[PDB]
Amino acid sequence: MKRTWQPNRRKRAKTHGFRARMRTPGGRKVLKRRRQKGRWRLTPAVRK
Amino acid sequence: AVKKFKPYTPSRRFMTVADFSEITKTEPEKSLVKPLKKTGGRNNQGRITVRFRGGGHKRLYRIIDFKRWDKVGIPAKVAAIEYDPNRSARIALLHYVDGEKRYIIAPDGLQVGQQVVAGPDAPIQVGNALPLRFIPVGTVVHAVELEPKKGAKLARAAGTSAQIQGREGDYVILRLPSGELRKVHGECYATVGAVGNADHKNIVLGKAGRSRWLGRRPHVRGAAMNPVDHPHGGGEGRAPRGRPPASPWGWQTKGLKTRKRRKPSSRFIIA
RNA sequence: GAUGUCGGCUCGUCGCAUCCUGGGGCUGAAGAAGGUCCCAAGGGUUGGGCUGUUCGCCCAUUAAAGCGGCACGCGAGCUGG
RNA sequence: GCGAAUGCCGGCAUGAGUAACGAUAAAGAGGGUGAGAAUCCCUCUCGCCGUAAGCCCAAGGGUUCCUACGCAAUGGUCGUCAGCGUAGGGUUAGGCGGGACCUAAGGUGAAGCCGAAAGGCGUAGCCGAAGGGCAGCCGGUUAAUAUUCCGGCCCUUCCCGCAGGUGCGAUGGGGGGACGCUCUAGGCUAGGGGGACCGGAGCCAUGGACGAGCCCGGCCAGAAGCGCAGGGUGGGAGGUAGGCAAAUCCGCCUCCCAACAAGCUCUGCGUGGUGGGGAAGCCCGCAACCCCCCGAAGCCAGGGAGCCAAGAAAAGCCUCUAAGCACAACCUGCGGGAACCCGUACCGCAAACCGACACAGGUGGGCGGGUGCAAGAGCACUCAGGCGCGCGGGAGAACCCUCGCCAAGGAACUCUGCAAGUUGGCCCCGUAACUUCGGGAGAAGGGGUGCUCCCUGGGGUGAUGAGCCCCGGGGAGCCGCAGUGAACAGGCUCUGGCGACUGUUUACCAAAAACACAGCUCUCUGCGAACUCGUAAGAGGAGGUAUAGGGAGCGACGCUUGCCCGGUGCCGGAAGGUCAAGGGGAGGGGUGCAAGCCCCGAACCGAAGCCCCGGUGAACGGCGGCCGUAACUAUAACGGUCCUAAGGUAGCGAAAUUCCUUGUCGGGUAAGUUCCGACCUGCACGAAAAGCGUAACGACCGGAGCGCUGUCUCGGCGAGGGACCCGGUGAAAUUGAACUGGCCGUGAAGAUGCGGCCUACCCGUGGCAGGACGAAAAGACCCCGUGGAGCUUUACUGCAGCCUGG
RNA sequence: GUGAGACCCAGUGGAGGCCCGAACCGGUGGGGGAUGCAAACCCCUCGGAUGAGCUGGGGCUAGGAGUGAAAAGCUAACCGA
RNA sequence: UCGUGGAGCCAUGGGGGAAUCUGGGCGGACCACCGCCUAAGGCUAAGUACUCCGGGUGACCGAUAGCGCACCAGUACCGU
RNA sequence: CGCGGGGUGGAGCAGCCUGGUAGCUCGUCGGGCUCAUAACCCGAAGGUCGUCGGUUCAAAUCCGGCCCCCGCAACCA
RNA sequence: CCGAGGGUAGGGCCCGUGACUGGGGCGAAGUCGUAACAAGGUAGCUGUACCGGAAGGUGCGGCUGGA
RNA sequence: GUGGGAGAGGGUGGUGGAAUUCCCGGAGUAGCGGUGAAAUGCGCAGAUACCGGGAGGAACGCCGAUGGCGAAGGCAGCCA
Ligand SMILES: NC[C@@H]1O[C@H](O[C@H]2[C@@H](O)[C@H](O[C@@H]3[C@@H](O)[C@H](N)C[C@H](N)[C@H]3O[C@H]3O[C@H](CO)[C@@H](O)[C@H](O)[C@H]3N)O[C@@H]2CO)[C@H](N)[C@@H](O)[C@@H]1O
Ligand SMILES: [Mg+2]
Ligand SMILES: [Mg+2]
Ligand SMILES: [Mg+2]
Ligand SMILES: [Mg+2]
Ligand SMILES: [Mg+2]
Ligand SMILES: [Mg+2]
Ligand SMILES: [Mg+2]
Ligand SMILES: [Mg+2]
Ligand SMILES: [Mg+2]
Ligand SMILES: [Mg+2]
Ligand SMILES: [Mg+2]
Ligand SMILES: [Mg+2]
Ligand SMILES: [Mg+2]
Ligand SMILES: [Mg+2]
Ligand SMILES: [Mg+2]
Ligand SMILES: [Mg+2]
Ligand SMILES: [Mg+2]
Ligand SMILES: [Mg+2]
Ligand SMILES: [Mg+2]
Ligand SMILES: [Mg+2]
Ligand SMILES: [Mg+2]
Ligand SMILES: [Mg+2]
Ligand SMILES: [Mg+2]
Ligand SMILES: [Mg+2]
Ligand SMILES: [Mg+2]
Ligand SMILES: [Mg+2]
Ligand SMILES: [Mg+2]
Ligand SMILES: [Mg+2]
Ligand SMILES: [Mg+2]
Ligand SMILES: [Mg+2]
Ligand SMILES: [Mg+2]
Ligand SMILES: [Mg+2]
Ligand SMILES: [Mg+2]
Ligand SMILES: [Mg+2]
Ligand SMILES: [Mg+2]
Ligand SMILES: [Mg+2]
Ligand SMILES: [Mg+2]
Ligand SMILES: [Mg+2]
Ligand SMILES: [Mg+2]
Ligand SMILES: [Mg+2]
Ligand SMILES: [Mg+2]
Ligand SMILES: [Mg+2]
Ligand SMILES: [Mg+2]
Ligand SMILES: [Mg+2]
Ligand SMILES: [Mg+2]
Ligand SMILES: [Mg+2]
Ligand SMILES: [Mg+2]
Ligand SMILES: [Mg+2]
Ligand SMILES: [Mg+2]
Ligand SMILES: [Mg+2]
Ligand SMILES: [Mg+2]
Ligand SMILES: [Mg+2]
Ligand SMILES: [Mg+2]
Ligand SMILES: [Mg+2]
Ligand SMILES: [Mg+2]
Ligand SMILES: [Mg+2]
Ligand SMILES: [Mg+2]
Ligand SMILES: [Mg+2]
Ligand SMILES: [Mg+2]
Ligand SMILES: [Mg+2]
Ligand SMILES: [Mg+2]
Ligand SMILES: [Mg+2]
Ligand SMILES: [Mg+2]
Ligand SMILES: [Mg+2]
Ligand SMILES: [Mg+2]
Ligand SMILES: [Mg+2]
Ligand SMILES: [Mg+2]
Ligand SMILES: [Mg+2]
Ligand SMILES: [Mg+2]
Ligand SMILES: [Mg+2]
Ligand SMILES: [Mg+2]
Ligand SMILES: [Mg+2]
Ligand SMILES: [Mg+2]
Ligand SMILES: [Mg+2]
Ligand SMILES: [Mg+2]
Ligand SMILES: [Mg+2]
Ligand SMILES: [Mg+2]
Ligand SMILES: [Mg+2]
Ligand SMILES: [Mg+2]
Ligand SMILES: [Mg+2]
Ligand SMILES: [Mg+2]
Ligand SMILES: [Mg+2]
Ligand SMILES: [Mg+2]
Ligand SMILES: [Mg+2]
Ligand SMILES: [Mg+2]
Ligand SMILES: [Mg+2]
Ligand SMILES: [Mg+2]
Ligand SMILES: [Mg+2]
Ligand SMILES: [Mg+2]
Ligand SMILES: [Mg+2]
Ligand SMILES: [Mg+2]
Ligand SMILES: [Mg+2]
Ligand SMILES: [Mg+2]
Ligand SMILES: [Mg+2]
Ligand SMILES: [Mg+2]
Ligand SMILES: [Mg+2]
Ligand SMILES: [Mg+2]
Ligand SMILES: [Mg+2]
Ligand SMILES: [Mg+2]
Ligand SMILES: [Mg+2]
Ligand SMILES: [Mg+2]
Ligand SMILES: [Mg+2]
Ligand SMILES: [Mg+2]
Ligand SMILES: [Mg+2]
Ligand SMILES: [Mg+2]
Ligand SMILES: [Mg+2]
Ligand SMILES: [Mg+2]
Ligand SMILES: [Mg+2]
Ligand SMILES: [Mg+2]
Ligand SMILES: [Mg+2]
Ligand SMILES: [Mg+2]
Ligand SMILES: [Mg+2]
Ligand SMILES: [Mg+2]
Ligand SMILES: [Mg+2]
Ligand SMILES: [Mg+2]
Ligand SMILES: [Mg+2]
Ligand SMILES: [Mg+2]
Ligand SMILES: [Mg+2]
Ligand SMILES: [Mg+2]
Ligand SMILES: [Mg+2]
Ligand SMILES: [Mg+2]
Ligand SMILES: [Mg+2]
Ligand SMILES: [Mg+2]
Ligand SMILES: [Mg+2]
Ligand SMILES: [Mg+2]
Ligand SMILES: [Mg+2]
Ligand SMILES: [Mg+2]
Ligand SMILES: [Mg+2]
Ligand SMILES: [Mg+2]
Ligand SMILES: [Mg+2]
Ligand SMILES: [Mg+2]
Ligand SMILES: [Mg+2]
Ligand SMILES: [Mg+2]
Ligand SMILES: [Mg+2]
Ligand SMILES: [Mg+2]
Ligand SMILES: [Mg+2]
Ligand SMILES: [Mg+2]
Ligand SMILES: [Mg+2]
Ligand SMILES: [Mg+2]
Ligand SMILES: [Mg+2]
Ligand SMILES: [Mg+2]
Ligand SMILES: [Mg+2]
Ligand SMILES: [Mg+2]
Ligand SMILES: [Mg+2]
Ligand SMILES: [Mg+2]
Ligand SMILES: [Mg+2]
Ligand SMILES: [Mg+2]
Ligand SMILES: [Mg+2]
Ligand SMILES: [Mg+2]
Ligand SMILES: [Mg+2]
Ligand SMILES: [Mg+2]
Ligand SMILES: [Mg+2]
Ligand SMILES: [Mg+2]
Ligand SMILES: [Mg+2]
Ligand SMILES: [Mg+2]
Ligand SMILES: [Mg+2]
Ligand SMILES: [Mg+2]
Ligand SMILES: [Mg+2]
Ligand SMILES: [Mg+2]
Ligand SMILES: [Mg+2]
Ligand SMILES: [Mg+2]
Ligand SMILES: [Mg+2]
Ligand SMILES: [Mg+2]
Ligand SMILES: [Mg+2]
Ligand SMILES: [Mg+2]
Ligand SMILES: [Mg+2]
Ligand SMILES: [Mg+2]
Ligand SMILES: [Mg+2]
Ligand SMILES: [Mg+2]
Ligand SMILES: [Mg+2]
Ligand SMILES: [Mg+2]
Ligand SMILES: [Mg+2]
Ligand SMILES: [Mg+2]
Ligand SMILES: [Mg+2]
Ligand SMILES: [Mg+2]
Ligand SMILES: [Mg+2]
Ligand SMILES: [Mg+2]
Ligand SMILES: [Mg+2]
Ligand SMILES: [Mg+2]
Ligand SMILES: [Mg+2]
Ligand SMILES: [Mg+2]
Ligand SMILES: [Mg+2]
Ligand SMILES: [Mg+2]
Ligand SMILES: [Mg+2]
Ligand SMILES: [Mg+2]
Ligand SMILES: [Mg+2]
Ligand SMILES: [Mg+2]
Ligand SMILES: [Mg+2]
Ligand SMILES: [Mg+2]
Ligand SMILES: [Mg+2]
Ligand SMILES: [Mg+2]
Ligand SMILES: [Mg+2]
Ligand SMILES: [Mg+2]
Ligand SMILES: [Mg+2]
Ligand SMILES: [Mg+2]
Ligand SMILES: [Mg+2]
Ligand SMILES: [Mg+2]
Ligand SMILES: [Mg+2]
Ligand SMILES: [Mg+2]
Ligand SMILES: [Mg+2]
Ligand SMILES: [Mg+2]
Ligand SMILES: [Mg+2]
Ligand SMILES: [Mg+2]
Ligand SMILES: [Mg+2]
Ligand SMILES: [Mg+2]
Ligand SMILES: [Mg+2]
Ligand SMILES: [Mg+2]
Ligand SMILES: [Mg+2]
Ligand SMILES: [Mg+2]
Ligand SMILES: [Mg+2]
Ligand SMILES: [Mg+2]
Ligand SMILES: [Mg+2]
Ligand SMILES: [Mg+2]
Ligand SMILES: [Mg+2]
Ligand SMILES: [Mg+2]
Ligand SMILES: [Mg+2]
């Protein structure tokens, strides 16, 4: 039956995007924490 | 009159609708910078702040003239009497001799063809606006202004009206639709006559939907909810409030006066 | 750190303090009947109406339509009223 | 220093060669290939799908695409095969879709407003699309791309030169773009069906047929012009207080003509120079391309009619003038030139997307042929095209699943007709109570239904006439058990309860009598409304204005909705009582030699609140007891008395409410703890937490009947899929170790394991579930813990909010 | 039809939270399934189907908060926080 | 240290509101003496804190330890 | 079974926690007004205080035990 | 073909009986009050409407068959 | 038919003063009101009584009659 994950490229970008993460101070902290832990992908890698 | 229907379906054996003859001679709006895209929306900045609104037929907004001292003395012919989705009252499309067209909340009696004008000089007859000071004590008027130059705000609902009770200083005493007795400045305009389309208070919605077409979604009762949702909610198997009628926010809802006490607005009221 | 709880259905088996059917002594036993006690379960111990009902109370029968134990036998057998 | 912590990590066991191998659409054989093939390739049979199980597009997926090699692993078996491994190819655009266009909700956000900071609103502007706007059709090619390359035909922008035109010219003005739902006319087209006509290789089988036979196919695109359908549209001439007047453009008045039109415009459709395609047939090769009929949901499109709930924006595009500039400049021609960026493979109802899987689940748009059935996208069969579902082979037990049938009976089954049967389409007869006059109605109960031949009426297209189709009407006649001969396809009625009705809900145990609902009543709110969100700014309410908006309860409609303001709440009371700061300072105290400086501090004046006074019930709420009494008895209209704020009215009543209770009569039944009707000592109905009713409605709950049946007496046979056997692959919970029997005792009170006695060769397989206090879940209930949460209030204490004096 | 009406007939017309019934949206009863095909599925059956309808794409509201035709329901497979 | 306490001192949202050395604050209510100090402007090394980084040591670990990673780890994989 | 309330002249009620004092209404009885019955007027009579015993000088009154009438409870299973 | 009659189904009229319930007629001397007839001690009546043990009372309008 | 008369016949619109009630303002003080007598009730929170200003509804005194009009029910301020 109709499952939880229904992939939408634009939605993903607009939601968890780099720019998106940048606007909100909360997001800027995310980018901070991740960059500082060593993640290879700061943001959900998705190509268009 | 109101149109009634045979009972060829329930919810429609009770249903009734308006006598649209009054309108006629025009269904299409006077586009000419008369209607505007009108934004729907039961909430403000996210949260719903008025319950149960939403849905309801698409609607175009007709911009009407609620301050007529613009064209003082410039007379106009009454082009038509159209339908307005945005109100109980019907509007009248009136061409000015000027060439400029405007809309006015159609008073009762007004007819396509008649002439009309606003001003002090203006003759005391249906459709004409003038400062209350220049209106004969006793005459019925609608679309009254509250403070001068601020525009009309009283007696605008279908078939509503205010009557002049007499002057007294720069003010004139009006008995408002509600029945309140307010002193209103003499400079406040007001067009003579009643609001018209008084059969309105009589149309019987009929079915559960239709109340929907009017953009009103279902209103659920307090007791029906739970202790958390409303003060009435709760109690195992049907209950009686539980003392004493209250709103979901908790204020008493039967008889408790609410208007602000120290409001300067008083001093000019009496009813 | 769990022994599924009523009733029913299905499958039974056991006790005798015996409801039939076998013997028997009394009788206020003439006969045909019955009553009461004695021995004896080998085998029997019906179909419906009402109720979740156990139990009952009815209807129509019967030789009789017995009582009670088995975790008020039986939910890794079924049903869930 | 480990033996236990349902300990942690890892490894390997047990169950076990067991369950299972993922839709019961289905397979067989012959050839190949190869080390090896049920499983790969080819062929021939066979079966399944066919509004698809076939095509095309979006999303998402990202090389899965094509070719050559390959088989460890991955495929639930096999594998030579593959969506798998290695390698190499492969995606071509001025016109398709996006961007160098437009705006929607919304987002962002110069100004501007607010906020401890972070940040919140927000104008212009900018961003934002399956919506608007915009120029490509038919074929041909590749292993793999194609409206992308190529062919033919037809367009679009810009730039230059040039000839010929005109007051040219905005981010400004106006027009326009531009819009609903349901129902529809006339033409068309797509699509489809026939043809005695056109073109074709061929075939006469098996009893017959050389046949007006059988079989195949009879189109696509196409500028200008040309027709045929439509859509748009009055022309004039003067004034003008409006278009934040800048206009000869709009808009307004005024007036010659003219109008179910004409002309002018703009589409659609045929037609068209011409290009293109072109089967069945053996050896791998013959071409027409015409005529009727049906005919859209599509086109003409901004067509028409009706209705109430009254149906986006902006740009392009016309037009108008502003500065300006008139050498500019726009406009039309005509040739030359210029024409960027991104996507394009493949999958795409699924083995490539979301579900950990090659998962019987989920996933938006378009096409979706033919015959038959009243119609259809339905059902049955079938084209094209695609599949037989990635373990097989036998056997023919119980038992289970799905399915067919049954003597006689026909609900006796059972909590309950649960389930299954019966009925089923269409045409015609013909239909009751009751009702809100619509309905109840498909009431019920019946008859007809196939094919053959004859006569006969209307229509559409033609042309009036033949063909071709569309509706019919009447006679005779034939065959079967049976004619909607298969598939789709109501069982019916009577009487209660609840809710009026359609509708909503507990995603994943509750679809209901619950919620909602039209409608009734109460109440607040005069607009910078009340109310809601927010510290605020600000916003919703509402570009609304009491015929409106918020809160509450009841819940269509009908007839109605009584008494009690004692307490509680709310509304009203400029008096008084009390009352905080604050004002006021009689009077008193600490110090100084003092002037002083400090402290207390009474009268009295001091809000809201509470007190007090009064109102108020569709506000919270409440709405009695005990004695006696009639000329038989019974009973009590009547009387006494106590208490109250007042003592329950109409109506209903052993009820969705009645404990005693299966109340008592009556009805129905052979029999009725249920049901219906009555009664009324109502444990404990009762009037908007509404009372009593009500036609219609209901996958709601009860009681009866008819029909019909495997529900049952009572079980029997048969079918397919498992189970069983052989080949391949091969799990799981659980598990202290086991060499694991019965009885009567015993024991922590329910023993394979102690005692006694009694049976008992060792080991499996197919079955059944009594025990192993079997498994699974550190019992939900229960209690306990000075454990936790959600909820309530006249529990305590705070805070928001609101009232209030200074 | 009447003084004129009301009104009554046929005909046309095509209304409706109207009826039957596919797509589509559901989820009524039963059976199967229960280490499943599946962490809600399958078969038969059944409700709605021009409306309070269904649905694609783009948007907005959230933790004592949102949303809620009201179940303490839903807020990414267990929500009294 | 100061929880209203006899509660000063230092800050300061509200109200009133001076003086410039005969000025003005403090020495724990308040007075009086005695004594301390000069508010309502600003700057100022060093001693002090930490360890991403380089080095040196260790009655520190030795691949179930030691950082989560001795190895191509904030990776694979899981989750929107 | 378990809680609490109540038995006072003939009827229906006070009195009792603060013991010595039995009150109210109705009815009953005698007398009046009336032709007469009611009504109305005057006057009067009547009370083991349910009980069994105990404390006290003294008990309806306080403390116990019984007989009564009416209510309230009876839940998780 | 018709067809007595039989069968099935659904309507109509009439009669009997029915727990229980409603008034009504009738019966020497039972209970409560006293509406009406004389200002019947509130003039009577009356259509309607509400209400009450009962007669009845009151509203509104009307009548004289009352002043 | 022509010419005239009387009438509260009917229907519509409009309008006049008296009186009641209530609201506001003034002045004023201890009762008012009500009956058979009373009580309830209203009033020192300022009533009754009096003046002024205003809102609203219903009914039309004198004329009026023992009168007139209408088919009946019924019809009465003034105006058209
Ligand atoms: N009278 C017959 C009708 O019914 C009623 O009348 C009935 C009653 O009113 C009447 O009852 C009367 C009573 O009124 C009066 N005050 C007392 C009297 N003793 C009773 O009498 C009654 O009962 C007795 C037995 O007890 C019988 O013998 C006698 O016939 C009978 N009428 O008895 C009548 C029965 O017949 C109506 N009031 C009357 O108008 C009507 O016509
Ligand atoms: Mg997942
Ligand atoms: Mg997208
Ligand atoms: Mg990103
Ligand atoms: Mg990931
Ligand atoms: Mg509601
Ligand atoms: Mg609830
Ligand atoms: Mg919540
Ligand atoms: Mg409350
Ligand atoms: Mg609450
Ligand atoms: Mg209840
Ligand atoms: Mg409550
Ligand atoms: Mg334990
Ligand atoms: Mg255990
Ligand atoms: Mg014996
Ligand atoms: Mg026996
Ligand atoms: Mg039963
Ligand atoms: Mg039974
Ligand atoms: Mg025993
Ligand atoms: Mg037994
Ligand atoms: Mg048992
Ligand atoms: Mg088993
Ligand atoms: Mg149950
Ligand atoms: Mg069940
Ligand atoms: Mg250990
Ligand atoms: Mg382990
Ligand atoms: Mg294992
Ligand atoms: Mg086994
Ligand atoms: Mg096996
Ligand atoms: Mg097997
Ligand atoms: Mg398979
Ligand atoms: Mg070979
Ligand atoms: Mg087929
Ligand atoms: Mg893609
Ligand atoms: Mg690959
Ligand atoms: Mg491939
Ligand atoms: Mg090869
Ligand atoms: Mg393999
Ligand atoms: Mg090979
Ligand atoms: Mg490959
Ligand atoms: Mg392009
Ligand atoms: Mg915008
Ligand atoms: Mg913003
Ligand atoms: Mg912002
Ligand atoms: Mg854009
Ligand atoms: Mg677009
Ligand atoms: Mg559009
Ligand atoms: Mg457009
Ligand atoms: Mg577009
Ligand atoms: Mg394009
Ligand atoms: Mg073309
Ligand atoms: Mg391809
Ligand atoms: Mg120009
Ligand atoms: Mg414009
Ligand atoms: Mg425009
Ligand atoms: Mg348009
Ligand atoms: Mg057509
Ligand atoms: Mg064609
Ligand atoms: Mg053909
Ligand atoms: Mg032919
Ligand atoms: Mg032959
Ligand atoms: Mg064609
Ligand atoms: Mg052509
Ligand atoms: Mg052309
Ligand atoms: Mg034309
Ligand atoms: Mg013109
Ligand atoms: Mg200008
Ligand atoms: Mg002009
Ligand atoms: Mg041609
Ligand atoms: Mg031709
Ligand atoms: Mg046609
Ligand atoms: Mg100029
Ligand atoms: Mg110029
Ligand atoms: Mg570029
Ligand atoms: Mg492609
Ligand atoms: Mg599809
Ligand atoms: Mg699938
Ligand atoms: Mg997946
Ligand atoms: Mg597979
Ligand atoms: Mg779908
Ligand atoms: Mg059909
Ligand atoms: Mg089909
Ligand atoms: Mg079998
Ligand atoms: Mg049979
Ligand atoms: Mg038979
Ligand atoms: Mg039975
Ligand atoms: Mg039985
Ligand atoms: Mg039952
Ligand atoms: Mg059934
Ligand atoms: Mg009937
Ligand atoms: Mg009838
Ligand atoms: Mg019916
Ligand atoms: Mg029926
Ligand atoms: Mg035949
Ligand atoms: Mg059939
Ligand atoms: Mg079916
Ligand atoms: Mg009933
Ligand atoms: Mg319902
Ligand atoms: Mg429904
Ligand atoms: Mg919903
Ligand atoms: Mg649902
Ligand atoms: Mg559920
Ligand atoms: Mg349902
Ligand atoms: Mg369900
Ligand atoms: Mg609900
Ligand atoms: Mg607004
Ligand atoms: Mg409301
Ligand atoms: Mg309201
Ligand atoms: Mg309700
Ligand atoms: Mg109700
Ligand atoms: Mg009534
Ligand atoms: Mg009260
Ligand atoms: Mg009160
Ligand atoms: Mg007040
Ligand atoms: Mg003070
Ligand atoms: Mg002193
Ligand atoms: Mg003081
Ligand atoms: Mg006060
Ligand atoms: Mg009583
Ligand atoms: Mg007696
Ligand atoms: Mg006597
Ligand atoms: Mg007697
Ligand atoms: Mg008695
Ligand atoms: Mg009495
Ligand atoms: Mg009463
Ligand atoms: Mg009863
Ligand atoms: Mg009963
Ligand atoms: Mg009850
Ligand atoms: Mg009972
Ligand atoms: Mg009972
Ligand atoms: Mg009987
Ligand atoms: Mg009986
Ligand atoms: Mg029953
Ligand atoms: Mg029964
Ligand atoms: Mg009954
Ligand atoms: Mg009661
Ligand atoms: Mg009730
Ligand atoms: Mg009431
Ligand atoms: Mg109530
Ligand atoms: Mg009812
Ligand atoms: Mg009834
Ligand atoms: Mg239902
Ligand atoms: Mg029923
Ligand atoms: Mg029966
Ligand atoms: Mg069977
Ligand atoms: Mg095997
Ligand atoms: Mg034992
Ligand atoms: Mg032993
Ligand atoms: Mg041993
Ligand atoms: Mg075995
Ligand atoms: Mg076992
Ligand atoms: Mg266990
Ligand atoms: Mg435990
Ligand atoms: Mg529990
Ligand atoms: Mg404690
Ligand atoms: Mg407290
Ligand atoms: Mg006439
Ligand atoms: Mg008609
Ligand atoms: Mg419908
Ligand atoms: Mg339906
Ligand atoms: Mg349907
Ligand atoms: Mg099941
Ligand atoms: Mg269905
Ligand atoms: Mg979205
Ligand atoms: Mg959306
Ligand atoms: Mg939370
Ligand atoms: Mg969830
Ligand atoms: Mg919590
Ligand atoms: Mg939590
Ligand atoms: Mg100086
Ligand atoms: Mg200081
Ligand atoms: Mg200081
Ligand atoms: Mg100091
Ligand atoms: Mg000191
Ligand atoms: Mg110092
Ligand atoms: Mg420094
Ligand atoms: Mg420094
Ligand atoms: Mg250091
Ligand atoms: Mg070492
Ligand atoms: Mg490690
Ligand atoms: Mg090692
Ligand atoms: Mg490292
Ligand atoms: Mg006594
Ligand atoms: Mg004495
Ligand atoms: Mg006395
Ligand atoms: Mg006496
Ligand atoms: Mg005497
Ligand atoms: Mg015959
Ligand atoms: Mg009868
Ligand atoms: Mg009778
Ligand atoms: Mg009688
Ligand atoms: Mg009688
Ligand atoms: Mg007598
Ligand atoms: Mg009288
Ligand atoms: Mg009478
Ligand atoms: Mg009398
Ligand atoms: Mg009288
Ligand atoms: Mg009187
Ligand atoms: Mg009468
Ligand atoms: Mg009464
Ligand atoms: Mg009565
Ligand atoms: Mg009485
Ligand atoms: Mg009365
Ligand atoms: Mg009367
Ligand atoms: Mg009268
Ligand atoms: Mg009278
Ligand atoms: Mg009269
Ligand atoms: Mg009279
Ligand atoms: Mg008179
Ligand atoms: Mg008048
Ligand atoms: Mg007056
Ligand atoms: Mg009054
Ligand atoms: Mg006064
Ligand atoms: Mg005064
Ligand atoms: Mg007064
Ligand atoms: Mg006369
Ligand atoms: Mg009149």
mmCIF file of N, CA and C (backbone and C1' of nucleotides) in Angstrom, chain D residues 11-16:
data_model
loop_
_atom_site.group_PDB
_atom_site.id
_atom_site.type_symbol
_atom_site.label_atom_id
_atom_site.label_comp_id
_atom_site.label_asym_id
_atom_site.label_seq_id
_atom_site.Cartn_x
_atom_site.Cartn_y
_atom_site.Cartn_z
ATOM 1 P P G D 11 30.083 -14.453 13.125
ATOM 2 O "O5'" G D 11 30.615 -15.852 13.677
ATOM 3 C "C5'" G D 11 31.999 -16.242 13.493
ATOM 4 C "C4'" G D 11 32.247 -17.603 14.091
ATOM 5 C "C3'" G D 11 31.250 -18.671 13.691
ATOM 6 O "O3'" G D 11 31.606 -19.284 12.468
ATOM 7 C "C1'" G D 11 31.576 -18.726 16.028
ATOM 8 P P C D 12 30.454 -19.906 11.548
ATOM 9 O "O5'" C D 12 29.992 -21.196 12.354
ATOM 10 C "C5'" C D 12 30.926 -22.237 12.662
ATOM 11 C "C4'" C D 12 30.304 -23.242 13.588
ATOM 12 C "C3'" C D 12 28.904 -23.695 13.217
ATOM 13 O "O3'" C D 12 28.922 -24.722 12.238
ATOM 14 C "C1'" C D 12 29.016 -23.234 15.536
ATOM 15 P P A D 13 27.552 -25.423 11.804
ATOM 16 O "O5'" A D 13 27.194 -26.342 13.067
ATOM 17 C "C5'" A D 13 25.838 -26.825 13.296
ATOM 18 C "C4'" A D 13 25.667 -27.274 14.730
ATOM 19 C "C3'" A D 13 24.305 -27.824 15.108
ATOM 20 O "O3'" A D 13 24.203 -29.194 14.794
ATOM 21 C "C1'" A D 13 25.030 -26.292 16.763
ATOM 22 P P U D 14 22.957 -29.711 13.933
ATOM 23 O "O5'" U D 14 21.730 -29.548 14.930
ATOM 24 C "C5'" U D 14 21.664 -30.303 16.161
ATOM 25 C "C4'" U D 14 20.402 -29.955 16.931
ATOM 26 C "C3'" U D 14 19.120 -29.968 16.116
ATOM 27 O "O3'" U D 14 18.597 -31.291 16.086
ATOM 28 C "C1'" U D 14 19.238 -27.985 17.431
ATOM 29 P P G D 15 18.064 -31.921 14.710
ATOM 30 O "O5'" G D 15 16.607 -31.310 14.563
ATOM 31 C "C5'" G D 15 15.601 -31.534 15.563
ATOM 32 C "C4'" G D 15 14.589 -30.418 15.531
ATOM 33 C "C3'" G D 15 13.910 -30.177 14.181
ATOM 34 O "O3'" G D 15 12.729 -30.991 14.054
ATOM 35 C "C1'" G D 15 14.768 -28.130 15.050
ATOM 36 P P A D 16 12.203 -31.463 12.604
ATOM 37 O "O5'" A D 16 13.517 -31.954 11.855
ATOM 38 C "C5'" A D 16 13.423 -32.804 10.692
ATOM 39 C "C4'" A D 16 14.690 -32.726 9.867
ATOM 40 C "C3'" A D 16 16.003 -33.013 10.591
ATOM 41 O "O3'" A D 16 16.887 -33.625 9.654
ATOM 42 C "C1'" A D 16 16.052 -30.840 9.662
#
